[PDB]
Design a protein around this ligand. Structure first.
Ligand SMILES: Nc1ncnc2c1ncn2[C@@H]1O[C@H](COP(=O)(O)O)[C@@H](O)[C@H]1O
Ligand SMILES: [Cl-]
Ligand SMILES: [Mg+2]
Ligand SMILES: [Mg+2]
Ligand SMILES: [Mg+2]
Length: 145
């Protein structure tokens, strides 16, 4: 009965003059499982969470950080792994305006879509990640709009 810890980024960008209608986020499809979400991964030894999140984003999508926003999001879920071990997993997401063209690492990302938070919600089935996007949509509205 293991505990797993992961760190990721919700990557956002404005396709035009910044506003509610022009914010999009980089939704990705996970090669291992084909569920949708955001880039994330494990911290290397002694790495801080934000450092691990930045490195995992660059490794998986080639995107670079413009600015972090002063906000994090946390989810907790449980599953059984390939070898049938019960896992309790905690994922911490940072939120960042990003730059670059996406170049997915196909070993981890098998599809990419830039969508509004509400559009991307349609791709999400697990309740915990739906809560994440609901909170993130609530945040960008109060913080920016
Ligand atoms: N919210 C969730 N609830 C239950 N299982 C999940 C959830 N998210 C991902 N999984 C599963 O956990 C495994 C690892 O997914 P991930 O942590 O997203 O790499 C895969 O088998 C996923 O289908
Ligand atoms: Cl992970
Ligand atoms: Mg990953
Ligand atoms: Mg990774
Ligand atoms: Mg990794």
């Amino acid at each position: 009965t293991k505990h797993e810890y992961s760190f990721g980024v919700i990557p956002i960008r404005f396709f035009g003059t910044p506003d509610r209608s022009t914010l999009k986020a980089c939704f990705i499809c996970h090669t291992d499982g084909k569920h949708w979400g955001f880039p994330k991964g494990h911290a290397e030894e002694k790495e801080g969470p934000q450092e691990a999140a930045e490195r995992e984003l660059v490794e998986e999508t080639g995107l670079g950080i413009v600015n972090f926003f002063p906000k994090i999001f946390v989810e907790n879920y449980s599953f059984n792994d390939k070898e049938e071990i019960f896992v309790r997993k905690e994922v911490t997401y940072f939120l960042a305006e990003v730059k670059g063209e996406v170049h997915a690492d196909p070993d981890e990302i098998c599809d990419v879509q830039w969508l509004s938070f509400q559009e991307g919600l349609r791709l999400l089935n697990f309740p915990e990640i739906r809560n994440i996007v609901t909170e993130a949509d609530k945040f960008v509205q109060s913080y920016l709009f």
